[PDB]
Design a protein around this ligand. Structure first.
Ligand SMILES: CCCCCCCCCCCCCCCCCC(=O)OC[C@H](COP(=O)([O-])OCC(O)COP(=O)([O-])OC[C@@H](COC(=O)CCCCCCCCCCCCCCCCC)OC(=O)CCCCCCCCCCCCCCCCC)OC(=O)CCCCCCCCCCCCCCCCC
Ligand SMILES: CCCCCCCCCCCCCCCCCC(=O)OC[C@H](COP(=O)([O-])OCC(O)COP(=O)([O-])OC[C@@H](COC(=O)CCCCCCCCCCCCCCCCC)OC(=O)CCCCCCCCCCCCCCCCC)OC(=O)CCCCCCCCCCCCCCCCC
Ligand SMILES: CCCCCCCCCCCCCCCCCC(=O)OC[C@H](COP(=O)([O-])OCC(O)COP(=O)([O-])OC[C@@H](COC(=O)CCCCCCCCCCCCCCCCC)OC(=O)CCCCCCCCCCCCCCCCC)OC(=O)CCCCCCCCCCCCCCCCC
Ligand SMILES: CCCCCCCCCCCCCCCCCC(=O)OC[C@H](COP(=O)([O-])OCC(O)COP(=O)([O-])OC[C@@H](COC(=O)CCCCCCCCCCCCCCCCC)OC(=O)CCCCCCCCCCCCCCCCC)OC(=O)CCCCCCCCCCCCCCCCC
Ligand SMILES: CCCCCCCCCCCCCCCCCC(=O)OC[C@H](COP(=O)([O-])OCC(O)COP(=O)([O-])OC[C@@H](COC(=O)CCCCCCCCCCCCCCCCC)OC(=O)CCCCCCCCCCCCCCCCC)OC(=O)CCCCCCCCCCCCCCCCC
Ligand SMILES: CCCCCCCCCCCCCCCCCC(=O)OC[C@H](COP(=O)([O-])OCC[N+](C)(C)C)OC(=O)CCCCCCCCCCCCCCCCC
Ligand SMILES: CCCCCCCC/C=C/CCCCCCCC(=O)OC[C@H](COP(=O)(O)OCCN)OC(=O)CCCCCCC/C=C/CCCCCCCC
Ligand SMILES: CCCCCCCCCCCCO[C@@H]1O[C@H](CO)[C@@H](O[C@H]2O[C@H](CO)[C@@H](O)[C@H](O)[C@H]2O)[C@H](O)[C@H]1O
Lengths: 62, 103, 139, 57, 383, 135, 80, 53
């Protein structure tokens, strides 16, 4: 119902309550997983599967 | 003082709730359950292949065939069924031997 | 003063509720959060207003203990279960239920394999049951 | 475990208030129906008069 | 009451003698009922004999009307005595329970035997004839009184809550009657004060409009079996018949002042059949007489004058109020010196709790003043 | 007579496991039994920290389940179909090759309907194997 | 104030202006946690749950966990 | 330790009386309060005059 509770004023206060500490940890995970995907999936050495035209989900569901 | 929800144990309260509080709802639910298990409790092999598998049917091993093979082996072994009987083959045993020698 | 809870409010403001008259009003004009008399009741304004009572150390003239005859009623019946006993029973039951649900959650979301895997490395592919046994005449 | 308990908890305050009012009403009745009864007793002057008459005065 | 092995042994030992006694009582009660029914059919009013139909104004469902479908035979003493009427009432209760059990047996064949074992282990639903000694009868009466205690408060609360939530009394006297009607048995209710509630509830709900759930509660409180309940016009008929017999007997006693000459045990039984005197209260003759006189006063002069009793719903509530014991309270007051949330002490207070304590504690006025002054200064600076 | 219908018929003592139960109730009551913890039909509490703690945990365990149990099936199907049509054929590859294939599958998942169609449509003249490679 | 959809509750004033003006403020009696109390930042002086553990440190911990989750298979791949 | 309230609430809920507001009973009982001494004098006076007549 969103009636009350501890509310940090800014980022630096997220460490003043264990629950918000876990929340900021989770937010860090969430936002930092995107740069990781950028680096991993736009890598120079990433190579498409040679057999990618052998089979695809598009033919299977069709 | 006595109250059903506070004094009676859970099974007793369940029976009371669905017999003297919501009996018609229980009756309708049982009716619908019977209907579902009478008309919506079957799935053909083709339907299983089309929609019954999360990623698709693995034809490269055909688990349905293995399942049916196990089923039929179990039935034959337990019930002592002679699969060479003419009714199963449509021909006499001697004709079966002749065919085996031919092929 | 301690950190214990008080009479539950449901997140409601008693100065505007439909049963506000049931909640005593103090000198400051703030209706209590409980049937009891509260001197330091306050109202907080989030998206919705809600009443709050802060426990404090206050001395109240304690009337001397009466005799057991004038307040004890020995009308207890075999079916009767007191609220304290009910709370004890429910606490124990919910503790055991919580442990069981925790085990179930762990098994389901971290150990239980999904049925009918494409590779066949995990989960069952299904099998038949209720097959006849020892009934040669059936065939 | 959840619903009936919550509604009982919601009921408690109103019932407490009403029962307090009922008790106040009954004590109010106790005091309302009390009256001081002043009794009247035969005046002794008539007794004295009858005594005089008996004397034949 | 819960089942027990001792009661099971008692009822198993007395099973066949109990059945034989029940059969004899059945013959006697059939004779009595034949007399009563012949008298009703011969001298009864046209509406009562013809079973006039009274339909509800909302859904037009037929039910017994207290005025038309109930008749007090003022001249029944000539043919039937008071003791015969009491015997018929007791046999009606026993026959109802036995009939339900026999119906279960016929329906389920030989699969009712374990349920019969559950039945004989408790005296709640066994006939009175199964008790061959005074102690057994006392235990049976205790079980019946326990069932009445279990069931009555629900009926009283249903009635009171529905009326109070959907209606209010018209005048002060009705208010007083309504409030005093549902007092606990530890206090004595004045029937003259309480009677107007009958007319008020007649304005709200007559016996012809009684709801099925309230009827179920009432039948539970009257030791009348409720399974299978079925339509409300079956147990309703049972209730009507029982209270019609009770009213006939009451008129007989009032006219002939039989209760004054009635002995102690018979008087106690007479009160008990009216649901006025529990056996566990160990009442003396004075208290029984007081309760019986209060019941007669509640019936009112019109009962003798014309055989018209007050509203049956309110009458049942009034009589069953004697089984509404005060709410139990056990434990010395010293127990109130303990604490309930000691297990939380180790957790302490978090930042929000500390803030709330600081703002709403003894320093609340200072904090409020400081905060308001700071906000006013900031607002002035902004402007 | 065999079993009681009343909850009052106790099966254990009042002090059985009192301490652990008190700890569990302390855990339950500290954040929930508060004036500002007003629920909406028992499902949506008023305490902010409850959301802040439970949303991440629910997402975490759901994602772990999905990644290690559900999407794994699609990944394995792709690996098997594109590299022999049999599990042994895939196992004939090295771990690094499997990693490459699975990451390509992740690429395809990320593209979905908003990306180049050459990942599954073979342009004319392409020298890579076709659908009838293993047939 | 607000942090996303979470709004900080505010206590309604209970004293009138006349009574309020007569109140004498003595911050010496206030706890050290709440001195120079500001409604717009009441937790500025609130102690840290763990000494030396900053919010940025936890954010970075989560980011590192995500990086591990995405990169562990690149360094220690496993066969089907 | 307030058994009457407990019993009434539990019975009301167990008989399908979920609602927690009773405006009519409150309206009947809201203005109830202990009388002042002068009111007691007046009411006793009315009772006494009634008894006399
Ligand atoms: C010893 C037990 C009693 C023996 C018999 C006693 C004497 C007879 C009794 C009365 C018989 C009624 C006959 C029919 C009347 C008319 C209705 C009708 O048309 O019926 C069709 C059909 C009967 O067929 P039929 O008409 O006799 O003729 C055969 C035809 O040739 C078939 O033609 P068809 O095309 O209709 O066939 C399709 C299919 C159609 O089959 C169905 O549709 C099956 C429907 C089942 C309905 C169940 C009703 C009760 C539901 C309770 C609430 C459950 C909520 C959901 C819970 C989910 C999670 C568990 O028919 C069947 O194969 C019938 C098989 C029935 C098996 C019943 C097994 C019940 C299991 C209950 C499990 C409960 C688990 C709770 C766990 C809780 C733990 C905390 O189905 C039923 O009648 C279903 C109801 C049967 C009730 C039996 C009596 C009560 C249950 C006793 C056993 C309890 C076991 C508990 C196990 C617990 C394990 C943990
Ligand atoms: C294992 C066994 C399985 C058993 C299965 C069978 C069913 C269950 C059996 C019985 C279960 C026990 C409980 C039953 C309910 C009890 C009700 C109750 O408490 O009544 C008290 C009540 C006593 O109170 P009362 O104050 O003396 O009188 C009531 C007041 O009048 C009340 O005053 P009021 O103000 O309320 O007045 C209104 C009252 C007035 O009514 C009455 O109360 C009078 C009595 C009922 C009269 C019913 C007959 C009406 C005329 C029918 C004309 C049909 C012509 C068709 C011609 C066709 C030509 C081709 O009610 C009505 O107006 C209702 C009328 C009926 C409407 C029926 C509508 C049906 C629609 C059908 C839809 C489509 C169906 C599917 C398609 C079919 C075609 C393809 O009892 C009765 O009045 C009679 C009760 C009769 C009970 C049922 C007996 C069952 C016998 C079963 C034999 C067959 C067994 C087969 C076994 C198979 C193998 C297992
Ligand atoms: C073999 C086949 C079996 C078929 C399957 C049966 C399945 C079981 C169902 C139940 C069967 C009945 C069980 C026995 C009951 C005992 C006899 C009796 O009626 O007691 C009086 C008593 C009457 O109650 P009431 O409320 O006072 O009656 C109001 C009337 O105004 C009362 O009128 P009143 O105020 O003017 O006063 C009259 C009173 C005045 O009398 C007295 O005061 C003297 C006492 C008389 C009654 C004594 C009863 C004694 C009961 C205990 C017996 C001993 C048990 C021993 C157990 C241990 C054994 C080791 O006398 C009466 O009580 C007479 C009542 C009317 C006669 C009812 C009997 C009709 C059926 C029999 C004839 C069948 C002929 C078949 C022809 C075939 C042609 C093809 O019966 C009851 O307590 C009612 C039964 C309670 C259970 C109900 C269960 C549901 C029933 C649904 C049936 C639906 C139709 C059937 C299909 C079902 C499919 C699902
Ligand atoms: C020789 C004798 C003389 C001759 C015979 C005479 C005639 C005798 C018969 C007539 C007797 C009538 C009077 C009976 C009174 C006693 C009734 C009674 O039971 O009282 C409760 C009685 C205790 O009574 P009490 O202590 O005296 O307290 C009485 C109070 O006044 C409390 O009173 P209350 O009012 O509060 O209690 C009432 C409560 C009564 O209920 C209960 O209390 C529940 C009793 C069961 C509780 C079970 C709890 C334990 C569960 C255990 C589960 C398994 C655990 C694991 C086992 C592992 C084994 C290896 O609630 C109800 O009344 C609900 C009624 C529900 C009616 C249901 C109607 C369904 C109709 C279907 C819909 C139809 C719609 C129309 C469709 C039409 C379509 C055309 O309960 C017990 O003693 C519990 C017994 C538990 C036995 C063990 C568990 C079950 C074992 C099953 C074995 C199965 C073997 C075969 C398996 C095959 C598999 C393939
Ligand atoms: C956490 C999980 C825990 C486990 C959970 C388990 C799973 C449960 C899931 C589902 C639960 C809800 C299901 C609800 C279904 C729908 C109910 C509904 O629509 O009710 C409407 C409606 C509601 O009832 P009501 O009369 O308004 O009041 C109900 C209150 O509970 C009345 O309360 P009250 O306070 O007003 O009165 C209290 C007292 C008042 O005292 C009395 O009234 C005196 C004593 C009366 C004794 C009984 C008299 C019966 C007279 C004849 C009845 C008609 C018979 C019809 C023909 C026979 C049909 C079979 O009555 C009693 O104490 C009754 C005692 C009954 C004990 C039996 C209860 C069932 C326990 C299980 C035994 C059977 C197990 C079979 C399966 C296993 C097989 C291996 O039902 C009726 O109208 C009753 C009709 C009864 C017909 C007979 C039963 C038909 C069903 C088939 C029976 C099969 C027998 C098999 C024998 C063994 C074969 C091997
Ligand atoms: C890809 C294809 C998609 C197709 C989708 C189609 C829609 C599917 C929707 C499913 C979900 C919604 C279901 C809603 C419920 C539907 C209910 C329904 O239609 O069920 C009917 C069905 C009809 O049953 P039936 O199909 O067995 O009918 C038998 C009729 N003969 C024998 C002629 C074939 O009901 C049941 O299945 C339950 C039957 C048992 C319970 C009732 C027993 C009592 C019957 C009383 C009358 C007869 C006996 C005499 C009286 C009593 C004597 C004791
Ligand atoms: C009814 C049985 C008749 C035949 C005699 C069988 C005796 C078997 C030997 C049993 C020895 C152990 C007994 C332990 C005490 C059991 C007490 C009991 O029944 O309590 C029930 C109690 C529940 O109590 P409440 O519902 O809360 O209410 C109770 C009060 N109304 O149930 C339990 O906790 C389960 C206890 C199970 C004990 C073992 C019962 C075994 C019964 C076997 C019967 C079959 C015949 C056995 C023959 C054996 C020959 C060597
Ligand atoms: C399986 C069925 C079981 C049924 C169980 C119940 C049976 C009950 C039988 C009761 C028999 C009563 O017997 C009957 O009583 C009535 C009323 O006095 C008599 O009725 C007689 O007097 C009345 C009243 O003046 C007249 O309205 C009526 O015309 C006349 O016949 C009948 O002449 C008599 O035959």
């Amino acid at each position: 119902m969103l009636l009350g509770g501890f509310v940090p004023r800014r980022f630096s206060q997220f460490n003043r309550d264990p629950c918000w500490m876990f929340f900021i940890f989770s937010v860090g995970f969430w936002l930092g997983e995107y740069p990781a995907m950028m680096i991993k999936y736009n890598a120079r050495d990433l190579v498409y599967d040679p057999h990618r035209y052998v089979w695809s989900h598009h033919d299977d569901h069709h | 003082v006595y109250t059903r929800w506070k004094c009676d144990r859970l099974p007793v309260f369940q029976l009371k709730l669905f017999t003297q509080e919501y009996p018609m709802h229980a009756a309708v639910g049982i009716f619908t359950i019977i209907f579902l298990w009478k008309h919506m409790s079957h799935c053909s092999e083709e339907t299983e292949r089309k929609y019954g598998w999360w990623a698709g049917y693995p034809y490269w091993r055909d688990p349905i065939a293995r399942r049916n093979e196990t089923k039929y082996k179990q039935m034959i072994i337990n019930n002592d069924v002679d699969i060479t009987h003419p009714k199963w083959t449509g021909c006499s045993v001697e004709q079966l031997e002749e065919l085996s020698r031919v092929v | 003063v301690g950190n214990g809870p008080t009479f539950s409010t449901g997140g409601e403001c008693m100065n505007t509720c439909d049963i506000q008259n049931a909640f005593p009003m103090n000198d400051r004009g703030v209706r209590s959060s409980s049937p009891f008399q509260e001197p330091n009741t306050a109202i907080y304004d989030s998206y919705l207003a809600w009443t709050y009572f802060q426990p404090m150390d206050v001395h109240i003239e304690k009337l001397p203990a009466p005799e057991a005859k004038y307040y004890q009623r020995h009308t207890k019946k075999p079916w009767d279960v007191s609220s304290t006993e009910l709370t004890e029973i429910q606490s124990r039951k919910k503790y055991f239920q919580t442990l069981g649900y925790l085990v179930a959650f762990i098994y389901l979301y971290f150990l239980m394999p999904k049925e009918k895997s494409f590779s066949g490395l995990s989960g069952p592919d299904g099998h038949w049951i209720m097959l006849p046994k020892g009934r040669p005449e059936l065939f | 475990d959840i619903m009936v308990p919550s509604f009982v908890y919601n009921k408690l305050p109103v019932i407490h208030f009403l029962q307090e009012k009922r008790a106040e009403q009954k004590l109010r009745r106790v005091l309302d129906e009390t009256y001081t009864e002043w009794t009247e007793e035969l005046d002794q002057a008539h007794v004295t008069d009858a005594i005089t008459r008996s004397l034949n005065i | 009451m819960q089942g027990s092995w001792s009661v099971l042994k008692k009822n198993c030992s007395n099973f066949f003698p109990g059945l034989l006694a029940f059969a004899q009582q059945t013959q006697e009660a059939y004779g009595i009922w034949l007399r009563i029914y012949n008298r009703q059919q011969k001298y009864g009013p046209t509406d009562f004999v013809e079973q006039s139909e009274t339909f509800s104004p909302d859904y037009h469902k037929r039910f017994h009307s207290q005025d038309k479908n109930m008749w007090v035979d003022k001249e029944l003493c000539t043919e039937v005595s008071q003791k015969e009427v009491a015997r018929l009432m007791t046999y009606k209760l026993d026959m109802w329970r036995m009939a339900h059990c026999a119906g279960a047996l016929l329906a389920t064949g030989g699969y009712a035997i374990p349920f019969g074992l559950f039945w004989l282990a408790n005296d709640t639903w066994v006939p009175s004839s199964f008790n061959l000694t005074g102690e057994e009868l006392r235990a049976w009466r205790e079980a019946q009184d326990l069932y009445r205690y279990r069931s009555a408060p629900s009926y009283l609360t249903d009635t009171k809550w529905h009326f109070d939530f959907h209606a209010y009394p018209w005048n002060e006297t009705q208010e007083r009657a309504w409030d005093d009607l549902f007092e606990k048995n530890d206090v004595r209710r004045d029937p003259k004060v309480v009677r107007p509630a009958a007319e008020m509830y007649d304005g709200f709900i007559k016996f012809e409009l009684i709801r099925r759930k309230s009827l179920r509660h009432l039948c539970r409180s009257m030791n009348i079996p409720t399974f299978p309940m079925l339509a409300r016009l079956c147990n309703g008929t049972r209730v009507r018949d029982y209270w019609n017999l009770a009213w006939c007997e009451d008129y007989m006693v009032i006219t002939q002042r039989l209760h004054e000459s009635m002995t102690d045990e018979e008087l106690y039984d007479y009160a008990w059949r009216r649901y006025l005197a529990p056996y566990d209260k160990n009442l003396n003759r004075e208290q029984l007489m007081e309760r019986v006189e209060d019941y007669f006063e509640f019936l009112g002069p019109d009962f003798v004058a014309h055989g018209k009793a007050p509203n049956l719903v309110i009458l049942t509530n009034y009589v069953l109020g004697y089984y509404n014991d005060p709410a139990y309270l056990e434990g010395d007051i010293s127990e109130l010196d303990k604490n309930d949330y000691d297990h939380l002490a180790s957790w302490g207070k978090d930042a929000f709790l500390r803030r709330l304590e600081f703002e709403n504690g003894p320093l609340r006025d200072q904090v409020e003043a400081h905060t308001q002054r700071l906000l006013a200064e900031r607002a002035a600076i902004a402007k | 007579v065999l079993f009681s219908t009343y909850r009052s018929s106790r099966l254990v003592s009042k002090e059985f496991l009192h301490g652990p139960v008190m700890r569990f109730r302390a855990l339950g009551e500290y954040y929930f039994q508060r004036a500002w913890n007003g629920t909406l039909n028992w499902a949506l509490p008023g305490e902010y920290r409850l959301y802040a703690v439970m949303i991440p945990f629910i997402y975490f365990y759901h994602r772990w389940h999905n990644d290690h149990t559900l999407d794994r099936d699609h990944v394995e199907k792709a690996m098997i179909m594109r590299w022999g049509g049999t599990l042994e054929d895939v196992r004939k590859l090295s771990a690094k090759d499997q990693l490459r294939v699975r990451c390509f599958t992740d690429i395809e998942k990320l593209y979905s309907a908003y990306g180049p169609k050459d990942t599954y449509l073979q342009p004319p003249g392409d020298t890579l194997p076709g659908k009838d490679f293993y047939r | 104030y607000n942090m996303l959809v979470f709004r900080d509750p505010k206590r309604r004033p209970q004293l009138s202006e006349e009574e309020r003006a007569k109140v004498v403020v003595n911050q010496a009696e206030w706890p050290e946690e709440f001195k120079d109390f500001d409604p717009d930042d009441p937790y500025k002086n609130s102690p840290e749950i763990i000494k030396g553990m900053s919010s940025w440190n936890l954010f970075l911990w989560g980011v590192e966990c995500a990086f591990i989750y995405q990169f562990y298979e690149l360094v220690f791949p496993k066969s089907i | 330790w307030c058994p009457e309230v407990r019993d009434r609430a539990e019975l009301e809920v167990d008989i399908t009386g979920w609602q927690w507001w009773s405006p009519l009973e409150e309206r009947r009982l809201l203005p109830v309060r202990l009388r002042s001494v002068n009111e007691v004098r007046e009411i006793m006076s009315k009772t006494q005059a009634k008894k006399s007549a």
